Every structure is written in structure tokens, then in C-alpha cells.
Amino acid sequence: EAEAEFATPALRFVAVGDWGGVPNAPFHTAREMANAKEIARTVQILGADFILSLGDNFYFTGVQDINDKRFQETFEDVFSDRSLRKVPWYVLAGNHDHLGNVSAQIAYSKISKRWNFPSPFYRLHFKIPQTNVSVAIFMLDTVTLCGNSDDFLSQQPERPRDVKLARTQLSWLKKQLAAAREDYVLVAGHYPVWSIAEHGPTHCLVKQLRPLLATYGVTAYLCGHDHNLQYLQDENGVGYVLSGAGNFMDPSKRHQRKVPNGYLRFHYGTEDSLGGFAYVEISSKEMTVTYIEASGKSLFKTRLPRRARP
Ligand SMILES: *[C@@H]1O[C@H](CO)[C@@H](O)[C@H](O)[C@H]1NC(C)=O
Ligand SMILES: [Fe+3]
Ligand SMILES: [Fe+3]
């Protein structure tokens, strides 16, 4: 019957990176606040089961301890609209967070109900509600894997501080990807695999992480670190969602030529913009990704079919 209304079930989330305000009063920017507002509107119109932070949570040197007012001034008070208050955040660290006390950002999980950061790297598991279809997300700490970009003049992480700790995270990720039975597998980290902008591809991730994405049928890798919005897709059908425009916009196309031809499907970096983020919908059929500006405009939309997995 025409009047019978059945919704397509979907898991829905916002992916926002590099939103961490500024280290001087009032500890936030016009861009951070504009994005907090458009994120709230997006949750209230389209819905969201959670928010994923892609690192650089507090600029410029993270936090000192669990009592640092930055938690209040840059996070709690900014993302304060009532449509957001109970929506959980699942968080990982970026380079700027490792310049401070990262353990304090893990511990803050015990104080704020909505802040979830149980360890430097971890696995999340979700069902698409009202179905049997499941999604895994692996949250990586790319600083301990590759090094901190701020230690090098190139701003390219050239070596990890502790090689055995790096190797442990990579071995963990291999064991997990190999054993994952979920219908969709996503991996997230602060640093990019591919990006055409100011930092560009992270060589450590192109060498060590990229091979695993194809081997184990990962749908997408999500990241920030470059302060813009990009969508890329490789020959194996793996998507690269870059969303690091929660606070800054950088128009650099400096590494355009370091990315293989065909990969870039979308880039938005104009420095007039107030930034943006990405909204992801996962249904039984496909994963949809919409990039949304803080003005409210839809910039770009693409789909990733569900694939059978080994
Ligand atoms: C890091 O933060 C935790 C939680 O507040 C605190 O217990 C610890 O003393 C801090 N470490 C440093 C280096 O201050
Ligand atoms: Fe950043
Ligand atoms: Fe960064």
C-alpha cells in the first residue's frame, strides 16, 4: 500500500577531525563553533548513533591532566546543544595530543559519560539496529605506530619513538583484521594514507597499513591531520575519507602529485569556508558518505557497496 511507511535501517555517525580550538582564551574558534552547530543540526535532522573524533582534539599541546579546564572550554561547552548531550564520542589521539598527557584523555572517559577513549588503540563493534548486519571499527594510535610529525622538520613522521610498541600495535591489528567476521570493517587513525594536501601521504602508513586494507577487505580508512576534506578511492575499491576541517581550513594542494592518478574523487579546501565534516550511513546494502560544510551545504556524496569478505 502507498501509505505504508518502512524506514531503511542504518547505523549513522559523524566523523570530525582536528577540532581542538586554540591554546589561548577563549579556547575555541569561529570554525569550531560553526561546526559544533552544524553537527548538532545534522544529528537533529538526520540522526547519529555516535560521533568519531579523528584526533588533534586539543591544540596546540593537548591537555596536562584530567582536571585541565580545556576539557570544559574546548569540548564540553562547545558541543553543548541539547541534541548532542547524550550522543557518545569515540576518540583517538593525534600528533598534538601526544605533545601533552594522552593518558589524561583516556582517563577522562571515567568522568564524562559521552567521552569514550578506553585505550590508545581499540576495537568497536556495532549492529545496524533492527538487523543482523554488523560493523567493526578499529581505532589506531598512529603516533605510536609512526612517530610524531612535530618531531621532524619535514612534518612527516620518520620513525616511532619505540619500535617494539609500534610492532605490537601492527601485530594486534593483523590478528584482529584476520579474525574479523563483521560485514563491514573500517579502520580509523589520525594520519592519512593518501592525501594531496600540506602533509600529504604518510609513508609509514602507505608501507605498513595500506597492504592490510586490501588483504582483509576493509571498506574504508578514515582520518584527519590534513585540515581539509577529501575523498579518495584506490584500485581495490578501498575508500579514504579525510575529515580534518573541524577548526582550520588549509587550501594546500602541495602533495597532489604524490598521490597515484585516479585516486582523488573530491577535495575541498578554500580558506574562506568555516570547515566541515563527514556524515556516514551504513545500511545492509552500502555505506554512504556525505561531506557537509559548516554553512550546511552538501559538498559531495559517494557510496561504497557492501562486499563479501574472506
Ligand atoms: C597525566 O594525567 C593524569 C590524570 O590526571 C595524572 O594522574 C598524571 O599525573 C599526569 N601526568 C603528568 C605528566 O602530569
Ligand atoms: Fe591537526
Ligand atoms: Fe595532526
Report whether residue 256 contacts ligand 1, using a CB cutoff of 6 Å. no
| C-alpha to C-alpha distance for 62 and 24, rounded to whole angstroms | 13
Question: Binding site residues for Fe cation, as ranges?
Answer: 18, 56, 59, 95, 190, 225, 227
What's the gap in Å between 79 CA and the centre of ligand 2?
Answer: 19
Q: Which of 78, 6, 67 is nearest to 37 (CA)?
A: 78
Look-up of cell digits 602541495: 254
Q: Which of 133, 162, 155 is nearest to 252 (CA)?
A: 155
| C-alpha to C-alpha distance for 217 and 239, rounded to whole angstroms | 11
User: What letter represents residue 269's amino acid?
Assistant: G
Number of Cβ atoms within 10 Å of the Cβ of 195: 29
Report whether residue 101 contacts ligand 1, using a CB cutoff of 6 Å. yes
R_g of the chain computed on alpha carbons: 18
Look-up of cell digits 585505550: 119
Pocket test for ligand 1, best of 103, 106, 109 (most atoms within 8 A of CB): 103
Chain centre to alpha carbon of residue 13:
11
Per-residue three-class SS string for the chain: CCCCCCCCCCEEEEEECCCCCCCCCCCCCHHHHHHHHHHHHHHHHCCCCEEEECCCCCCCCCCCCCCCCHHHHHHHCCCCCCCCCCCCEEECCCCCHHHCCHHHHHHHHHCCCCEECCCCCEEEEEECCCCCCEEEEEECCHHHHHCCHHHCCCCCCCCCCCHHHHHHHHHHHHHHHHHCCCCEEEEECCCCCCCCCCCCCCHHHHHHCHHHHHHCCCCEEEECCCCCEEEEECCCCCEEEEECCCCCCCCCCCCHHHCCCCCEEEEECCCCCCCEEEEEEECCCEEEEEEEECCCCEEEEEEEECCCCC
Which domains are delineated in the chain? 1-310 (3.60.21.10)
Per the entry, the structure determination technique was X-ray
Residues 6+ apart with CB under 8 A from 256: 196, 264
| C-alpha to C-alpha distance for 178 and 276, rounded to whole angstroms | 34
Chain centre to alpha carbon of residue 143:
14
Q: Given its phi and psi angles, is residue 258 left (phi above 0), alpha (psi -120 to 50 degrees) or beta?
A: alpha
Rounded to 5 degrees, φ, ψ at 242 are -110, 120
User: Starting at the edge strand that comes first in sequence, how are the strands of the sheet with 134-139 ordered?
Assistant: 122-127, 134-139, 184-188, 220-223, 239-243, 229-233, 264-268
| C-alpha to C-alpha distance for 304 and 307, rounded to whole angstroms | 9
- The number of residues making up the chain comes to 310
Report whether residue 65 contacts ligand 1, using a CB cutoff of 6 Å. yes
* Cβ < 5 A residues, ion ligand 3: 56, 94-95, 225
Q: Which of 224, 217, 220 is nearest to 281 (CA)?
A: 220
Report whether residue 107 contacts ligand 1, using a CB cutoff of 6 Å. yes
